[PDB]
Amino acid sequence: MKTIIINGVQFNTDEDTTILKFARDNNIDISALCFLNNCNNDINKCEICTVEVEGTGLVTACDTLIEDGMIINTNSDAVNEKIKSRISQLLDIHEFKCGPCNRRENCEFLKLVIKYKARASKPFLPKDKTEYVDERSKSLTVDRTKCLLCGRCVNACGKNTETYAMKFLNKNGKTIIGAEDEKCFDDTNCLLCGQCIIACPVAALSEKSHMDRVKNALNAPEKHVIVAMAPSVRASIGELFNMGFGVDVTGKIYTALRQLGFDKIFDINFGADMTIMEEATELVQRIENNGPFPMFTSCCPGWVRQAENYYPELLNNLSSAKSPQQIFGTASKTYYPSISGLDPKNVFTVTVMPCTSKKFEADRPQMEKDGLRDIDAVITTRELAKMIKDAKIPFAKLEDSEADPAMGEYSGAGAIFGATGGVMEAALRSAKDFAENAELEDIEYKQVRGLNGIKEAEVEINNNKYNVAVINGASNLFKFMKSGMINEKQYHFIEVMACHGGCVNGGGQPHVNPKDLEKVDIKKVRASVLYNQDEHLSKRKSHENTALVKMYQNYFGKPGEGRAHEILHFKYKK
């Protein structure tokens, strides 16, 4: 047993771990900043975690392992001086702009300003922010005035995607972060997933705003503005209203959206039942001899870009069905003008996503028909959260309401989409039903569920064995392919998500604060909201959705054929 005494207080312990980790578990207050995702900034560390080890001196706690017979000083004198020295070097390449900063209510640096009574030697006040600002991307923006180059985005991009698209760059003898050759992220191998935003402690990395598009549509007299939220939104935005974690707020969001002035309150889970409608039929048609195989999902835009950039040979194997966002959006300007005698031209479609990559997808040139965009705007979870807050609508005290039915109803299959293995379980519910022409009772595919990186399963369809895999996160796609696991058998259907945990851990999601990030399993608790909705739902198959069935009978006519084949699909060729 190792005996350590941190600040006159004794602890006996056997675990070999760092001083920050042990002082995190036993509620002691060592402050950290560049440490995240099991790694600090290896090249020029921040030292906000400096402690004193007797005889040795001031060391960085985030990577100094505990030894038997230590005496450690954290709230010390010499230690607190070295940390404020570091804080008044970073708060010197930053501006006190907390209102109107998008990060003031949950910053991390602002917390450590008032904690240490951190003062700037000279206030950093650039006359022109243009050199620091990058708004060229459809998904990501950078404001280097706020960057305290901790390296967390570079590390998170390396651990989560292994693309290393977020790099440390040298610009005129100085170090900045950005894409390769300081290009716009969109023009590099970046998947636009937004995990770098999720690891950023400040306002430096942010999503490209689409809420000026939204407010102008709401104020435009002729425009009939439709909104629809992604599966993961109802499972997470309540964190931004101090409601906690794993809180189902579906009904409160529908009310809130009506108080913001939206004309129709629909839901992307209806579009998720549409995507399974097309994709499960295509899978049954591919099983009719070859297809080819494997069929891959095409609903994660982060993954589509990974395929386009690293595996262009797989772009043909990708499912023709549009993503829920895009397929809902195509129906927004065609089926929804049919009922409600409106001109397609005057309908404006807004989606609320846990994703930054969705903004690139919606803005793709060919995601339109006859000049009308499938989706006109995509605000993230965080952006809808600010809309609600600016309007002072009291989210947590709100009464529940339902969505307008025609394009707002959803089944349990569409509900679990926001979690990893969600699209796989939903597709297999309709694919085994279609191929066997039966209403099967056994619908749970628990073996493709969960937080494992690579999950496989053998499903039986028409007394024949098929192999399916679920790739949880873009780094694991690289592992899948490069290791040759892809060749250990003939795979028939493969789900790929770019974010680990699925869309519930997407790039446009609420930031967590590392104290709560150590105690809460975010991916598990956000996803449990979705699965619990599936369990209590009476319809748990996409083709059983009553509103979906009559769109297809009165307007598209049969999945994967004629009208449904011509406008509800998209194939990538580069």
Stretch that binds ligand FES, among 34-42, 170-178, 429-437, 556-564 (CB under 6 A): 34-42
C-beta closer to ligand FES: residue 49 or 140: 49
How far is Cα 122 from Cα 304, in angstroms, rounded to an integer? 46
184 annotated ligand binder: no
Task: Report yes or no: 124 and 95 within 8 Å, Cβ to Cβ.
Answer: yes
**Is 62 a known ligand-binding residue?**
yes
DSSP assignment of 275-303: HHHHHHHHHHHHHSS-SSS-EE----HHH
Q: Which 194-233 residues touch ligand SF4, going by CB under 6 A?
A: 194-196, 199-205
DSSP letter assigned to residue 318 = B
The conformation of residue 388, written as its DSSP 8-state character, comes to H
Interacting residues of 355 by C-beta distance below 8 A, sequence separation 6+: 193, 194, 230, 301, 302, 378, 380, 499, 503, 506, 507, 508
Q: What is the distance between the alpha carbons of residues 301 and 281, in angstroms, rounded to a whole number?
A: 21
Neighbour-count burial of 356, counting CB atoms closer than 10 A to its CB (0-12 exposed, 13-18 middle, 19+ buried) = buried
Per DSSP, 561 falls in state S
Closest to ligand SF4 by CB, 225 or 377:
377
Non-local CB neighbours of 330 within 8 Å, separated by 6+ positions: 322, 369, 374, 567, 568
Nearest residue to 327 via CA among 298, 296, 356, 293: 298
In the stretch 307-346, what mask flags binding to ligand HC1 with x, by CB under 6 A? ----------------xxx---------------------
* Site track for ligand FES across 271-310, x = CB under 6 A: ----------------------------------------
294 binds ligand HC1 (CB under 6 A): no
CA distance 350 to 551: 20
Q: How far is the CB of 36 from ligand FES (least distance, A)?
A: 8
Using CA of residue 10, residue 16, residue 18, residue 22, what is the dihedral sign?
Answer: negative
CB of 496 to ligand SF4, least distance (A): 9
The verdict on 146 binding ligand SF4 (CB under 6 A) reads yes
Peptide bond into 294 cis (omega under 30): yes
Which of 417, 445, 493, 570 touches ligand HC1 (CB under 6 A)? 417
Which is closer to ligand SF4, CB of 190 or CB of 367? 190
Between the CA of residue 230 and those of 358, 410, 415, 429, what are the distances in Å?
11, 12, 9, 20
* Footprint on residues 47-76 left by ligand FES (CB under 6 A): 47-49, 60, 62
Q: C-beta of 366: minimal distance to ligand SF4 in Å?
A: 19
Q: After which residues is the chain broken (C to N over 2.5 A)?
A: none
Q: Is 471 in the site for ligand SF4 (CB under 6 A)?
A: no
Sole binder of ligand FES in the list 18, 40, 475, 533 (CB under 6 A) = 40
90, 268, 362, 471: which one binds ligand HC1 (CB under 6 A): 268
Q: Which of 422, 352, 419, 385 is nearest to 511 (CA)?
A: 385
Residue 40 touches which member of ligand FES, ligand HC1, ligand SF4, none, C-beta under 5-8 Å by kind: ligand FES
Our CB check for ligand FES shows the closer of 58 and 315 to be 58
Find, among 96, 357, 386, the residue nearest to 207 by Cα. 357
Among the listed ranges 85-93, 102-110, 155-163, 268-276, the one in contact with ligand HC1 (CB under 6 A) is 268-276
Specify binding-site residues: 34, 46, 49, 62, 94, 98, 101, 107, 147, 150, 153, 157, 190, 193, 196, 200, 300, 355, 499, 503
User: Which positions touch ligand HC1 (CB under 6 A)?
Assistant: 230-232, 268-269, 272, 275, 299-300, 323-325, 353-355, 358, 417-418, 423, 497, 503, 506
User: Which positions touch ligand SF4 (CB under 6 A)?
Assistant: 94-95, 97-98, 101, 103-104, 107, 109-110, 140, 146-153, 156-157, 160-161, 163, 165-166, 177, 185, 190-196, 199-205, 300-302, 354-355, 357-358, 497-499, 502-503, 506-507
